């Protein structure tokens, strides 16, 4: 997953989870990448799927 093209003002709402380094399950890549941007690049991908 590459978040370079973020942030994005809107995300679709399908569920295909990713697990962040903050132990939070992110619902989809768009939500995850917007969170990475919001963290000013501190959040990273832990693994694919639910945490």
């Amino acid at each position: 997953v590459d978040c370079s093209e973020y942030p994005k003002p809107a995300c679709t709402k399908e569920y295909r989870p990713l697990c962040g380094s903050d132990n939070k399950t992110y619902g989809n890549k768009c939500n995850f990448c917007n969170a990475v941007v919001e963290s000013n690049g501190t959040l990273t991908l832990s693994h694919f799927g639910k945490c």
């Binding site: 093209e5 994005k8 809107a10 679709t12 709402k13 399908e14 569920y15 619902g27």
Partner: protein, 185 residues
Amino acid sequence: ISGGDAIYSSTGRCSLGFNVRSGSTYYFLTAGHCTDGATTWWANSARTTVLGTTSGSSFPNNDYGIVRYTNTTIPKDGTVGGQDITSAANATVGMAVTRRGSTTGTHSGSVTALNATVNYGGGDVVYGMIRTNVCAEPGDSGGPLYSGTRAIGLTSGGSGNCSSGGTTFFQPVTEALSAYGVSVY
């Protein structure tokens, strides 16, 4: 199974929009971004209960898709959870609406604008969307937006979440009904 319930494709989970029919043929509507590249749909994460197969998909530009039921025994309620749906209508600014999705359940709000353009990026732009102050989260895609017994739209996307609040855009259901020649029941 009814509006708002979970649906699973080979890729992920979305929500069933509305059960609809044409003659004796039953289908269900959901988001086009969920039907895009999906063939078979199941009622559970285990993929043991089949629902049907994708018959049409329109995304981007619009955001609707339709799945033809191949499961003969599963009940196909013309409701949203318990809520009966008896017709479809066009959203109007100020209209009180309710959304049901497989992740967040039921949430309410109002229509704040019409004919909105939402850019999901990468050339995925959808037009003519209903804007609302109703929240939605991943898994809620394709779920119904209704007002009383009236079907209004299908969840497409937006920003925020249900804890902090957000803005969700919906595809007008009337447009999908017309495209496929189906109707709610």
